[PDB]
C-alpha cells in the first residue's frame, strides 16, 4: 500500500482502554479496595546521578548563610493553616467530601502551608485520631497535556495505567458508585489549576463535581493565582452548587518577611566559627575563630523593599542570598581562597544586590553603541519630535540621517566621518544610499528590543517605532558629546 504521508516516530504508551465500570460484574461485586496490594500505592533513578569526589570542598563561613537561605529549606500563616486544617480535618473525620480553593500571588507560601497542613493531618492519622487517607499531588504546570491529571490520579488510586478518558470514567464510577466502607479517603492538591483550565473547564468542573458526591470521600485543595477563576470558568449557579471554601493569600508585610529571614538565620547570626586560615574552610562551634553577623537594618530595608513591590518570600530570601554571595566574592578575592575578626554582611551589599534588580540596562546599552546606531536613534527622535507620530517610515529616517550629515558640514567630527559613513573610507567605493552598517544596526536594535519594525517588504515605507520609551532615548543621546551639541 502506497501511503500519502508517514508517521515514523509514533511512541504510544501501553495504557488500557477499559474503564473501572467493567472490572467487576455488579456494584456489589467490588471487594475491599483498601485490602488490595495495587490500590492506594500498596524512584530508582538516584544512582544514575552519582559520582565520587577527589578533593574536599572548602566551605567558607558565608556558604552556611547561602545554603541556609534556600527555598528548598510556618511563621505568619496561622489563620490560613487553621482554616485549611479544620476544613480538611472536619471533612475527614465525618467521611465527607469537600473542596478548598486557595488563591494568591506567587511566593506567598500557599503550597508550603497546604503541604504542612497535609503532613499534620498525616501525623494525626498516625495517632489514629482520624482514619487513614491517600495523598495525591497534581501540578498543572508539570504536564504535557492537561488531561494527564486524569491519568495520574487514577494511577495513584488503583495502580493501573489507563488512557485519560477511560481514567475519567473510572474516577467518576469510583467517586459515585463505590461504597464508602470499601474505599479510602483521598486528599488531592490541585496546584496551578489555571494551567489545567486554559483550553476548557472540564477538569475544573469534574474535580469540583466529584466532591458533591455522597460516596466520594474526597478532599480537593485547589491552588490558583487569581480569585475569580471559578467564577469565570464555571457559572455562579455551579459555584453556588458546590460551595467551596474560599481562602485568599495576601502578600507578606515587611515585618513578616524579616521574621522569615532571621528564622532562616536563627542559628547562624552572632555565632562562632573555626576558620582554616590557609584554605578558608569554616566549622561551626593555624585556626582563627571568626564571628559572623548580618546587621538588622540590612534585612530590614531588604524586607521593606520586597514588601512594597511583590511581598513574596522568594525575592527577600534571594536578595539576602545574593548579598551573602557578593560578600563572599569580595572575601574570597581579598584572601586569595579557592573553590576546592568579624565577618559581616553589610548594608551596602544588600544595597548592591537590590540595585541589580532595581536598575535597567537600557540607557547603559544605548550609551555604548556605535555612532551609526546613535545616529539612527537621534534621527528617530528628531522625526517623532517633528511630526509627532510615534511610528516613522524608514525612508524618512534615511532622509533625516542624510540631512543631519549635510547640515553639519562645519563640524569637525562630521567632516572627518562622512567619508567613512558613505564610502567606507575608500575612493573606489561609490557613494551609498544607506550609511555603512545600516542594516547591521537596524537588526541589532531590533534584536535588543529597542526597536519594533512592522513586516513589510518595501524597505522605504516600512515603519519603525521605539519599543522602550522616549525618555531613556533622550537620556542616552544627551550623554553623547557629539549628538548633544548638534
Amino acid at each position: 500500500v502506497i501511503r500519502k504521508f508517514t508517521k515514523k516516530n509514533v511512541a504510544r504508551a501501553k495504557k488500557k482502554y477499559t474503564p473501572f465500570s467493567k472490572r467487576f460484574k455488579s456494584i456489589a461485586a467490588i471487594p475491599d479496595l483498601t485490602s488490595l496490594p495495587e490500590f492506594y500505592g500498596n524512584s530508582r533513578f538516584e544512582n544514575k546521578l552519582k559520582t565520587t569526589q577527589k578533593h574536599q570542598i572548602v566551605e567558607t563561613i558565608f556558604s552556611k548563610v547561602k545554603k541556609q537561605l534556600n527555598s528548598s529549606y510556618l511563621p505568619a500563616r496561622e489563620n490560613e493553616f487553621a482554616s485549611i486544617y479544620l476544613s480538611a480535618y472536619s471533612a475527614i473525620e465525618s467521611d465527607s467530601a469537600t473542596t478548598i480553593y486557595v488563591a494568591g500571588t506567587p511566593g506567598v507560601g500557599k503550597t508550603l502551608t497546604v503541604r504542612e497542613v497535609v503532613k499534620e493531618l498525616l501525623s494525626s492519622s498516625a495517632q489514629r485520631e482520624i482514619p487513614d487517607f491517600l495523598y495525591v499531588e497534581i501540578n498543572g504546570l508539570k504536564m504535557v497535556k492537561p488531561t494527564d491529571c486524569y491519568e495520574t490520579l487514577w494511577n495513584k488510586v488503583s495502580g493501573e495505567r489507563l488512557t485519560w478518558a477511560a481514567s475519567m470514567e473510572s474516577l467518576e464510577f469510583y467517586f459515585k458508585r463505590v461504597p464508602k466502607n470499601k474505599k479510602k479517603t483521598i486528599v488531592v492538591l490541585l496546584d496551578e489549576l489555571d494551567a489545567m483550565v486554559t483550553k476548557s473547564q472540564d477538569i475544573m468542573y469534574n474535580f469540583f463535581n466529584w466532591t458533591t458526591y455522597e460516596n466520594a470521600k474526597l478532599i480537593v485543595i485547589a491552588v490558583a493565582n487569581t480569585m475569580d477563576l471559578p467564577e469565570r470558568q464555571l457559572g455562579n449557579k455551579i459555584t453556588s452548587r458546590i460551595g467551596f471554601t474560599r481562602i485568599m493569600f495576601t502578600g507578606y508585610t515587611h515585618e513578616e518577611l524579616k521574621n522569615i529571614i532571621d528564622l532562616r538565620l536563627k542559628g547562624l547570626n552572632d555565632s562562632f566559627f573555626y576558620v582554616d586560615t590557609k584554605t578558608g574552610n569554616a566549622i561551626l562551634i593555624d585556626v582563627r575563630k571568626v564571628r559572623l553577623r548580618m546587621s538588622a537594618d540590612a534585612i530590614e530595608i531588604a524586607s521593606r523593599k520586597v514588601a512594597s513591590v511583590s511581598g513574596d518570600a522568594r525575592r527577600a530570601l534571594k536578595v539576602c542570598k545574593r548579598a551573602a554571595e557578593i560578600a563572599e566574592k569580595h572575601y574570597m578575592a581579598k584572601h586569595g581562597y579557592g573553590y576546592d575578626g568579624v565577618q559581616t554582611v553589610h548594608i551596602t551589599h544588600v544595597m548592591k544586590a537590590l540595585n541589580e534588580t532595581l536598575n535597567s540596562h537600557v540607557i547603559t546599552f544605548m550609551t555604548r553603541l556605535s555612532f551609526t546606531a546613535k545616529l539612527f536613534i537621534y534621527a528617530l527622535l528628531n522625526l517623532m519630535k517633528k511630526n509627532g507620530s510615534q511610528e516613522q517610515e524608514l525612508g524618512d529616517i534615511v532622509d533625516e540621517i542624510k540631512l543631519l550629515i549635510e547640515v553639519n558640514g562645519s563640524n569637525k567630527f562630521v567632516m572627518e566621518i562622512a567619508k567613512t559613513l558613505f564610502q567606507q573610507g575608500s575612493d573606489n567605493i561609490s557613494e551609498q544610499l544607506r550609511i555603512i552598517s545600516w542594516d547591521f544596526v537596524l537588526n541589532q536594535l531590533l534584536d535588543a528590543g529597542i526597536l519594533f519594525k512592522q513586516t513589510m517588504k518595501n524597505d522605504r515605507i516600512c515603519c519603525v517605532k521605539l519599543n522602550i520609551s522616549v525618555e531613556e532615548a533622550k537620556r542616552a543621546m544627551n550623554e553623547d558629546e557629539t549628538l548633544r551639541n548638534l
Binding site: 508517514t6 515514523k8 516516530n9 542594516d439 547591521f440 537588526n443 541589532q444 534584536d447 517588504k457 524597505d459
Partner: protein
C-alpha cells in the same frame, strides 16, 4: 594546500573561496554564504572550485526541488548517508531511515547517530553541504535560516566528521535580515556587457560552429568561429537594452535566431560580414520571443463590461439614450470638462448586473414590425454567457471563494486589458475607441 582555478571574471570570488573552503576543519567557517542574482556565476564558480579540488568532500542539494523544510531535512540526512557510504565503503554503518527526520531536532539526532559510527577515521574531515538556492525555497519563512546557522552548535565539536554549510542565495534583503550573525559572505555582482559578451562567446561558439544547420548550409552551396562570434556580438548589440545583462535571455535569443541567420548565408555573404548582416537584418529589429473563439453575446458582454468598468455611471444617458419622448424631460447633459488622465491606465471600476445588461442592450445590434419589439432582452443565454465569462475570469467579482452570485452586495468588474478588448471589438466591428476619444 588548495588549488585556485581560473574563472574568467570571478578571480576575487575564487580567491575568497580558496580562503574559506578548506579540508582542515579548524580553519573553515561553519557557515559560508555566496550571494548573487541570477546568472552571476555562483554555481559555475563553486563547481569549478570543487572540481579543481577533488579531495574536498561536497554534497550538492538544490532546495528549489524540495519546496518545504521537511523534505529539505530528509534530503540532508539521505544525501549525507549516501555520500558517507560511497566515500568510506569499509566502515560498517546502520542505514538510518531519512523519513524518520520530521523535526530539526530529529535531524540533529540522526546526524549524530550517522557521525558516531565514523569515529575510526584517522584525521578530522569536512563535509560540505552546499544548499544551492536556499532562498529559492517556495515556502520560505524568516525563522528557517536561523535553524541552519545554529545547527553546528548542537553537534559534537570533537567529532571526526564535521559538517560545513555553504549557502547560495539570490535576494540582498533576505541576506540583510541576517546581518548581525557576521557570517562570511562572498558577493557575485552582475556582469557588464563586455563580460556577458565574452562569456557568451566562450560558452556558445563551439556549439554554434559545430551545429548541423551550418554544415548543411556550407554543403548546400576559424572563420566558422568568426561568424559565430560575430553573430553573438550582433545579438548583444541588438538586444542588450532589452535583455539587460541576462545570460539566459540572450542565450534563448541566440538559440532562436541562429538557424534563421544560417539560412541566409551565401557565398557572397560568408566573407562579407556587413552584407550578411544586411541580408538578415530582420532578426535584429524585433525580439520575436512569443508564441505567435467567443460567442457574439459573450463578445458584446465583454465590451459592455469594459464600458461599465471605465465610464462613470452618471453620464450613460448622454451617450446611449436615443428614444423619442412622449413625456417632457431632459437627459444627461454630459461631462463638462475632460479629464487629462486616461482611465484605462488604472484599475477597473465595479458595477451591478443591471447596469451591464442595460449597456449591453444599448450596444447590441438590432406592419410586421408592430408585433416585433426589436430590442434584445437578457434571456437565459445572456446569463449563461455571462456566467461562462465569469468562470473564464474575463469578468471578476469582489470575492473569489464561496461566491454569492445572487447577492446585491457582490459587484462585477472587467478583467481584460485594453488590447484584448480592442481586438475583440475589431473582431465584431464595434467602435470602442469612440466612447473614449471625447472623455480624455
Amino acid at each position: 594546500n588548495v588549488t585556485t582555478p581560473e574563472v574568467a571574471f570571478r578571480e576575487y570570488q575564487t580567491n575568497c573561496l580558496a580562503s574559506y573552503i578548506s579540508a582542515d576543519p579548524d580553519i573553515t567557517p561553519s557557515n559560508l554564504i555566496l550571494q548573487g542574482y541570477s546568472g552571476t556565476g555562483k554555481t559555475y564558480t563553486l563547481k569549478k572550485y570543487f572540481n579543481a579540488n577533488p579531495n574536498l568532500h561536497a554534497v550538492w542539494l538544490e532546495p528549489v526541488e524540495l519546496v518545504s523544510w521537511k523534505p529539505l531535512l530528509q534530503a540532508i540526512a539521505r544525501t549525507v548517508q549516501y555520500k558517507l557510504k560511497t566515500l568510506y565503503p569499509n566502515i560498517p554503518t546502520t542505514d538510518y531511515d531519512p523519513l524518520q527526520v520530521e523535526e530539526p531536532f530529529l535531524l540533529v539526532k540522526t546526524l549524530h547517530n550517522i557521525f558516531v559510527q565514523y569515529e575510526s577515521l584517522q584525521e578530522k574531515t569536512c563535509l560540505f553541504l552546499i544548499l544551492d538556492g536556499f532562498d529559492s525555497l517556495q515556502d520560505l519563512d524568516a525563522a528557517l535560516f536561523n535553524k541552519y546557522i545554529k545547527l553546528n552548535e548542537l553537534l559534537p565539536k570533537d567529532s571526526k566528521i564535521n559538517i560545513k554549510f555553504i549557502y547560495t542565495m539570490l535576494e540582498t534583503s533576505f541576506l540583510q535580515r541576517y546581518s548581525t550573525h557576521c557570517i562570511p559572505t562572498v558577493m557575485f555582482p552582475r556582469y557588464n556587457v563586455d563580460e556577458v559578451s565574452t562569456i557568451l562567446v566562450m560558452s556558445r561558439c563551439g556549439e554554434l560552429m559545430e551545429d548541423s544547420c551550418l554544415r548543411k548550409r556550407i554543403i548546400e552551396e576559424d572563420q566558422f568561429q568568426n561568424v559565430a562570434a560575430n553573430f553573438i556580438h550582433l545579438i548583444v548589440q541588438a538586444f542588450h537594452s532589452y535583455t539587460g545583462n541576462d545570460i539566459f535571455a540572450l542565450n534563448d535569443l541566440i538559440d532562436f535566431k541562429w538557424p534563421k541567420y544560417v539560412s541566409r548565408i551565401t557565398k557572397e555573404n560568408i566573407f562579407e560580414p556587413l552584407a550578411l548582416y544586411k541580408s538578415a537584418i530582420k532578426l535584429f529589429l524585433s525580439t520575436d520571443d512569443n508564441l505567435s473563439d467567443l460567442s457574439i453575446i459573450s463578445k458584446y458582454l465583454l465590451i459592455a463590461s469594459y464600458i461599465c468598468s471605465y465610464l462613470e455611471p452618471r453620464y450613460d444617458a448622454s451617450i446611449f439614450s436615443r428614444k423619442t419622448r412622449i413625456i417632457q424631460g431632459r437627459a444627461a447633459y454630459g461631462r463638462r470638462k475632460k479629464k487629462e488622465v486616461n482611465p484605462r491606465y488604472l484599475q477597473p471600476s465595479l458595477f451591478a448586473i443591471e447596469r451591464l445588461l442595460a449597456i449591453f442592450q444599448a450596444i447590441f445590434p438590432i406592419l410586421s414590425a408592430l408585433r416585433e419589439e426589436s430590442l434584445m432582452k437578457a434571456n437565459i443565454e445572456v446569463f449563461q454567457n455571462l456566467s461562462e465569462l465569469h468562470t473564464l475570469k474575463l469578468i471578476a467579482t469582489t470575492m473569489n471563494k464561496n461566491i454569492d452570485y445572487l447577492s446585491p452586495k457582490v459587484r462585477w468588474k472587467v478583467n481584460v486589458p485594453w488590447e484584448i478588448i480592442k481586438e475583440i471589438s475589431e473582431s465584431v466591428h464595434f467602435n470602442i475607441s469612440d466612447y473614449f476619444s471625447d472623455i480624455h
